[PDB]
Ligand binder design. Structure first.
Ligand SMILES: *[C@H]1O[C@H](CO)[C@@H](O)[C@H](O)[C@@H]1O
Ligand SMILES: [Zn+2]
Length: 167
């Protein structure tokens, strides 16, 4: 259900939800077929170790079972610095803010990518936190503290967006 969303916002959300589902699907597949260190993995999740790979694999397995198109969306927030937000314990509802409408459907810091970021926050999906924001900080987190990287929402978003594309 939509709450406080204009017609244009509903249309953008519909496209973003479908793209986010695709992002999660492709990301899950990647994690299932790559069971050793690769550029795309280490860049966002740090040094490859089975434990952490299992952690992210679980997150995407859970998110893949989510139906993004059936999520409830709320467009009342007007915070320009925030893309969106959710309550980890209240699954299925995403609250969109100002920056969301200025973001492209797909790509880096995209609407679709933001939904992946927010979905990862739900406890049912792994309950990621926000230890770092942005590609620069996310990459730094992956190198310096991989344990937090696999529990950081933006690292999941960037791994999924994969832009620039990495093998
Ligand atoms: C992440 O780090 C690994 C190093 O183990 C590379 O394989 C990859 O290119 C990326 O920089
Ligand atoms: Zn977040």
């Amino acid at each position: 259900t939509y709450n406080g969303c204009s017609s244009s916002e509903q249309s953008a959300l519909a496209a973003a939800a479908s793209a986010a589902q695709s992002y999660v699907a492709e990301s899950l597949s990647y994690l299932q077929t790559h069971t050793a260190a690769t550029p795309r993995y280490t860049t966002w999740f740090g040094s490859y170790i089975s434990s952490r790979h299992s952690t992210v694999l679980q997150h995407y397995t859970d998110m893949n079972s989510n139906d993004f198109s059936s999520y409830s969306f709320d467009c009342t927030c007007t915070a320009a610095g925030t893309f969106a937000y959710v309550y980890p314990n209240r699954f299925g509802t995403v609250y969109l803010c100002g920056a969301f409408w200025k973001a492209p459907t797909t790509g880096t810091d995209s609407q679709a990518g933001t939904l992946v970021h927010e979905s990862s926050h739900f406890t049912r999906n792994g309950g990621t936190k926000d230890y770092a924001y942005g590609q620069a900080a996310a990459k730094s987190l992956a190198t310096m503290d991989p344990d937090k990287a696999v529990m950081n929402a933006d690292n999941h978003e960037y791994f999924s967006e994969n832009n620039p594309a990495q093998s």
